[PDB]
């Protein structure tokens, strides 16, 4: 038995994050797309 389920049986339950790994990776793709194509204007107004 893994330690995750072992610690859960004593009240130590881990809450899942709001932003998943897929949603965080999509935020990084928007930053890269804005940095390569727009430069520094996508953070100080329109792209």
């Amino acid at each position: 038995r893994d330690l995750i389920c072992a610690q859960k049986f004593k009240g130590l339950t881990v809450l899942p994050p709001l932003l998943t790994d897929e949603m965080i990776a999509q935020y990084t793709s928007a930053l890269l797309a804005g940095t390569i194509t727009s430069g520094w204007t996508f953070g100080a107004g329109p792209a």
Partner: peptide, 29 residues
């Protein structure tokens, strides 16, 4: 999950750490 007493009185219940079997119904992560 309460949208506010001034708005309505309907509430949703989220049982953290269950698979909708050992408790609309929608199983989340």
């Amino acid at each position: 999950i309460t949208p506010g007493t001034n708005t309505s009185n309907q509430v949703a219940v989220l049982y953290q750490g269950v698979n909708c079997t050992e408790v609309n119904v929608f199983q989340t992560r």
